[PDB]
Each structure stands twice: as C-alpha cells, then as structure tokens.
Design a protein around this motif. Structure first.
Motif, short mmCIF file in Angstrom:
data_model
loop_
_atom_site.label_atom_id
_atom_site.label_comp_id
_atom_site.label_asym_id
_atom_site.label_seq_id
_atom_site.Cartn_x
_atom_site.Cartn_y
_atom_site.Cartn_z
N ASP A 35 45.30 37.42 37.58
CA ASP A 35 46.03 37.26 38.84
C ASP A 35 47.31 38.07 38.84
O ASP A 35 47.65 38.70 39.85
N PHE A 91 46.45 41.83 39.16
CA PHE A 91 46.09 42.08 40.55
C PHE A 91 47.32 42.08 41.45
O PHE A 91 47.50 42.99 42.27
N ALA A 92 48.16 41.05 41.32
CA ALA A 92 49.32 40.92 42.20
C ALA A 92 50.31 42.05 41.99
O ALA A 92 50.93 42.53 42.96
N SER A 149 49.53 45.03 41.00
CA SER A 149 48.93 46.24 41.57
C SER A 149 49.04 46.23 43.10
O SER A 149 49.30 47.28 43.71
N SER A 150 48.85 45.06 43.73
CA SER A 150 48.97 44.98 45.18
C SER A 150 50.41 45.21 45.61
O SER A 150 50.68 45.85 46.63
N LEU A 177 51.12 48.87 45.37
CA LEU A 177 50.42 49.56 46.44
C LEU A 177 51.15 49.42 47.77
O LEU A 177 51.29 50.40 48.52
N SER A 232 41.75 47.28 48.88
CA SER A 232 41.48 45.88 49.18
C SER A 232 39.99 45.65 49.40
O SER A 232 39.42 44.66 48.90
N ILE A 269 38.02 45.51 46.12
CA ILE A 269 38.12 44.26 45.38
C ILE A 269 37.30 43.16 46.05
O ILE A 269 36.65 42.35 45.38
N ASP A 320 39.69 35.41 44.28
CA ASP A 320 39.95 36.85 44.28
C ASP A 320 39.50 37.48 45.59
O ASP A 320 40.21 38.32 46.17
N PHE A 335 42.07 36.51 48.24
CA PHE A 335 43.31 37.29 48.18
C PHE A 335 43.08 38.71 48.70
O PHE A 335 43.90 39.25 49.44
N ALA A 336 41.97 39.33 48.30
CA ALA A 336 41.73 40.70 48.73
C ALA A 336 41.45 40.76 50.22
O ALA A 336 41.90 41.68 50.91
N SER A 393 44.71 40.50 52.05
CA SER A 393 45.39 41.78 52.00
C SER A 393 44.78 42.78 52.96
O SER A 393 45.50 43.55 53.63
N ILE A 450 52.68 37.13 47.15
CA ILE A 450 51.48 36.92 46.34
C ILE A 450 51.80 37.15 44.87
O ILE A 450 51.33 36.41 44.00
N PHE A 497 53.43 34.02 43.72
CA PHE A 497 52.46 32.99 43.34
C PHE A 497 52.02 33.17 41.88
O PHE A 497 52.06 32.23 41.09
N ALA A 498 51.60 34.39 41.51
CA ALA A 498 51.13 34.61 40.14
C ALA A 498 52.24 34.37 39.12
O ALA A 498 52.01 33.74 38.08
N1 LIG Z 1 43.71 37.63 42.43
C1 LIG Z 1 44.55 38.50 43.26
C2 LIG Z 1 45.93 38.35 43.36
N2 LIG Z 1 46.54 37.36 42.73
O1 LIG Z 1 47.86 37.15 42.88
O2 LIG Z 1 45.86 36.48 42.00
C3 LIG Z 1 46.69 39.22 44.15
C4 LIG Z 1 46.06 40.25 44.86
C5 LIG Z 1 44.68 40.38 44.75
O3 LIG Z 1 43.95 41.35 45.42
C6 LIG Z 1 44.45 42.64 45.54
C7 LIG Z 1 44.44 43.21 46.80
C8 LIG Z 1 44.87 44.53 46.96
C9 LIG Z 1 45.31 45.25 45.86
C10 LIG Z 1 45.30 44.68 44.61
C11 LIG Z 1 44.87 43.37 44.43
C12 LIG Z 1 43.94 39.52 43.96
CL1 LIG Z 1 42.17 39.75 43.87
#
Ligand SMILES: Nc1c([N+](=O)[O-])ccc(Oc2ccccc2)c1Cl
Lengths: 302, 324
Positions: free
Chosen positions: A97, A100-101, A103-104, A107, A120, A123, B118, B121-122, B125, B144, B147-148
């Motif tokens: 998590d 992922f977070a 990276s988002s 981005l 997005s 994923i 997952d 979240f995606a 986004s 987000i 949250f993590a």
């Molecule tokens: N699990 C997760 C979390 N997270 O905070 O757990 C944040 C974002 C996320 O999706 C993305 C969406 C776009 C780019 C990178 C990751 C996921 Cl798949």
C-alpha cells in the motif's frame, strides 16, 4: 521498503547512463525510451518527470508482486492470527500500500493527467485480472487471444504504459507516443511468452516432480495452448488435474512432441518483430539500438 | 435522525447510492460481489453528504446555478477511497465482521480482499484523473498516502502505552480526517471559490473529521455490544489505544500492565474497560471532540447563511450528541 527500492533504481540508472556514455528491466526501458524521445524533443537532459517515472514504474511493479503473493486464508476457522504472523501478511499489505501510494503521489505531482489515467488503468486491470486468475486454472478452452490479453493485463500493460509515458513526458508527437506504447506492449508480450516457454522447457528437463511449473498448477500458456489443438489426450489429462500417478510427466511429453513449443517460439518472434518495427519512427541512436537489442536478447533465451 | 439531518442533500445521496454499484464494473463477478458486500452493508455516507453540502454552499457563493458533474463524481470518488481503506483496514485488523456482514477477506481470503481494495484505490484515482483538475488530483494523492502512512504507524504502535495525544491526533488525521478535509476543500475547488474559502473548507473537514473519529473512539466503550455489533472495547483489545485510554493511562497506571500483557490474563480486558470508565478518560475525550467541533463551526463563518451552511453546522452538533 520504498527507500531501498528508490536507492537501487537510481544506482541501476547510474550505471545505465554511464554505460551508454561510451528488477532492472522496467526502469531501463523507461530510461532508454526517455533518452531516445528526449533527444527527438530537443531536450538537453532527462527531466525530473522522466527520472521519477522510472521509480514510479518499479514501485508499482514491486507493490504488485508483494500484494499478489499475499496468502489465501479463506477457509480457516482458527489459527489465522498465527498464519499471518508466520507469513508477514500485515507487513506485506502495508508495504505494498505505501509503495502504491508513494507512486501515486509522485505521479500526481508530475502533473500529467494522461499518464495518471494510463497508469491507474494498468493497476485496475492488474488487480481485476489477478482476482480472476484462480478461476482460469486448468481451463483448456482458453484461446490464444484470451492468453495474450491475460498476459497483457498481468505483464505487458505496465511496460507499455511506461514506454508511452516516457514519450509523453518528452513531449514528442502523439504518433510517436503511440509507437512507443506499441513497442512496450509487444516487447512485454514477447517477454511473457518467452518466460512461459522457459517455464515449460525447464520443467521438461528437470529431475524431480515439476510440481511448481505453470502446467502443473493449471496455468495454461502458449506452448500448451497450441499443443491442445492437436492433443486430445493432453486435454483429458489436464482436465483431470493430473490425478493419475505420473500423468503430469505424460502431459509434458505430449506438449514436447506436439508442435506447441515451436509455435509459441514463433509467436514470441512475431510480437518481437512488431516491437522492433515500432522503433523505426526513431532516428538512429545508441538508445534505439539498445531497445532493438532487448527484443533480440529476449528471443535469444530461446 | 440521520434522514432529518441530511434531507437537503437527500436527492444527491440517492443518486450516488444508485451509481456506486456500477462504479466497480460488471466484468468481474467476484469483484462485483466484494464491492456489493461493503456498499450494501449500511454505511452512513457522511463523506458524500459533506461533499454535496460544501459543493452546494460554495457553488451558491460562486454564482453557479447547479452542481457540476465534477461535484457529483467527487462524492462517489471519496466514498470509494473510504471503501478501499475499510477493506484493507479489515485485513490489517483481521476483523471478521463489518456492519452485520462478513468482511471481504472472510469470504474470499486475504489476497482477494487486498486486490479488491487495490482495484478500488486505482479506480478512485482513475475517476479523479478524468475530472481533469490537477490541484484536486494532488490533494487526494496526498490523502491516500496519508492512509498508508497511518496504517503503518498504527500497526507499529499496537499496545504502545507511551503513545502521546499528539500522536493519536496525527493517526486520527491519517486514518479519517485527512480524507474528509481534502474532500471538502476539493468540493470548494470545483465551485471555483477563493483560495481562502478553500482553506476554510479544508479546516472544516479536518476538524469535523477529528471530532467524528474521537466520538467513534468514545462509542467503542460507551456503546453496548449489540448496538455495536462487536463487544465494547474492541479497539483497546487489538491494541489500538484511543483518546479515552490515552487519558485514562494518566490516572490509572495499571492499564499499562494490562495493555502490555496484550490482555493475556483472563478477564483482563473487562478490567481495563473498568479502569477507563473509572478515570476521567471518557469526559476528557468528549471535550477533545468538542474543541475540534468548535473549530469546525468557526471555519464555516466565511460562508453566507444558507440551509447548506446550517446543515454543515448541524453535522458538528449531531456528532457530539451521537450515540450511533
Ligand atoms: N493500494 C493502493 C494505494 N494504497 O494507498 O494502498 C494507493 C494507490 C493505489 O493505486 C495507484 C493508483 C495510481 C498510481 C499508483 C497507485 C493503490 Cl492500488
């Protein structure tokens, strides 16, 4: 750890630039397409967006693997607390998590909305496909097109997104961005088919039970899908989930004697050729040559 | 009554509830089923309600004559992020139940539950990117990540009796208030009001979100086990020390021994809950909730009088009076 991962990428990036001066795969593709397209755009150096993109792609790849590896505790009535501690489930979920977070968040701060949409969607399709994966095991009705789509969602789509996004951040034309997308998609499919070929041939030449091979777990890939066209007994044995003793070994030899491995190898080559053709919208450069060579080196693993 | 409080945006919530089912898709039956399991389980939809209220208040202030599609999609996106968070929080907690129904990981295993979150979240986004506003995209991406960060901090401090109140408020921000604050600031952004009004709407959602979390933590004690679904003290039992316990620890040091033992000696959990009630913990936690609620109501004074503003003020009141 995001820290460690961002560290290795930069290090691996360093040697890459320093080499072209006179896993690593995904950041290397980002770097090479970045440099090829940045020169085309008139940029004098890679942008921050290019460098962050390479970190973003690898964080997503690694987070994807970490989550995909989480255990399935579904039927258990007790001992779940213990099995998650044994297998570090909470750490796996949290680490994935946060990666992922991170990276988002990277981005979003690169501020390209087209790239955010693209990644997005990658994923989404990855998570969706991996949920469905268990239901497709041992299904001998899978088509080659179903298998390529599955391989795209699992592997090639992120690679195609990464090479398109590298071109987008260079600001080259939409036509070149689409060609870089096609290079990444077709290299990713060629890469996945070769991995699947190798899982099979290695399984057929190993000394013990190939119990952990794709075919043994019901993950039916290109060589087996082709073989199933000409092998009625192969289908029956797979459908039986190799219940009969030593039937896995029989299925493996049926695939080996079929034309399936050769046909899969030619499938890998056609996708590779499409990849190489996608690069011809770029001028001659050490980066274009290296991108061409990755296709060749992949096919040379046989 | 929740229906009485929320009637001025009741039509906006009905439309949202209709849409939530399709927002996961229909190609993946297991994914559809997992989303249905939480969406249909009975959530209050506070977050979409706050988005609609602030959207309409700021839109009115800005001269807009109707809610934009961005306002509408934003409310869905916020509920989706909240839902993905709940799915992963239940995995991290090994909660077996969530509002009457079995958790996603109980039905499909932890791996499928993780991948479902997952996806959500995606998907969140991806919907937000299609609203084409990079300021909101950046704000939500920070939430987000918050949250993590918060889940990691909470897992790292389980049973840790040295947690401070400020640490608890940061954790509460990460877990709950940060998403609400960003949702109300983003509602203002999509109305085009000033940076200053946007900052006030952030502070409203932050302090209401903190106030809401503090009250939730109080209710985990003071509510009955049936009216909670789970027995009282369930947070304390998993080692999540909340405001009433942090306060109680200052007056009842045996709580430290009980918590440090992870409640190994039998009936020690009800002993701990007794100590919380004996202390001034619950009342000190309520006044913490009230302090944040007052800051929230103050952040609304930059808006004109409106039924929307009056309801945003009423949300603060309803939370403090809540038994839920
Ligand atoms: N699990 C997760 C979390 N997270 O905070 O757990 C944040 C974002 C996320 O999706 C993305 C969406 C776009 C780019 C990178 C990751 C996921 Cl798949």
């Amino acid at each position: 750890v995001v820290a460690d991962d961002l560290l290795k990428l930069n290090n691996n990036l360093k040697s890459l630039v320093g080499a072209e001066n006179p896993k690593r795969l995904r950041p290397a593709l980002v770097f090479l397409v970045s440099r090829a397209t940045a020169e085309l755009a008139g940029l004098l150096e890679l942008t921050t967006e290019h460098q962050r993109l390479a970190e973003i792609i690898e964080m997503i790849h690694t987070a994807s693997l970490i989550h995909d590896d989480v255990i399935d505790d579904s039927g258990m009535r007790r001992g779940k607390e213990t099995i998650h501690q044994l297998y570090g489930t909470r750490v796996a979920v949290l680490a994935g998590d946060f990666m992922f977070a991170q990276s988002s968040w990277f981005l979003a701060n690169l501020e390209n909305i087209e790239v955010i949409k693209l990644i997005s969607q990658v994923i989404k399709d990855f998570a969706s496909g991996e949920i469905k994966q268990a239901s497709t095991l041992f299904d001998c009705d899978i088509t080659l097109d179903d298998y390529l789509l599955k391989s795209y969602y699992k592997t090639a789509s992120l690679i195609a997104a990464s090479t398109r996004s590298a071109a987008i951040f260079s600001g080259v034309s939409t036509a070149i961005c689409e060609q870089m997308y096609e290079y990444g998609r077709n290299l990713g499919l060629s890469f996945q088919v070769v991995d699947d070929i190798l899982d099979f041939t290695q399984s057929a030449e190993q000394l013990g039970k190939p119990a952990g091979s794709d075919l043994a777990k019901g993950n039916l890939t290109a060589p087996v899908i082709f073989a199933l066209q000409d092998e009625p007994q192969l289908r029956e044995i797979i459908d039986s989930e190799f219940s009969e003793t030593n039937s896995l070994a029989t299925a493996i030899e049926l695939v080996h004697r079929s034309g399936g491995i050769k046909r899969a190898h030619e499938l890998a080559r056609e996708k590779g050729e499409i990849a190489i053709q996608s690069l011809q919208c770029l001028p001659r450069s050490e980066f274009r040559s290296t991108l061409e060579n990755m296709v060749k080196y992949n096919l040379e693993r046989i």
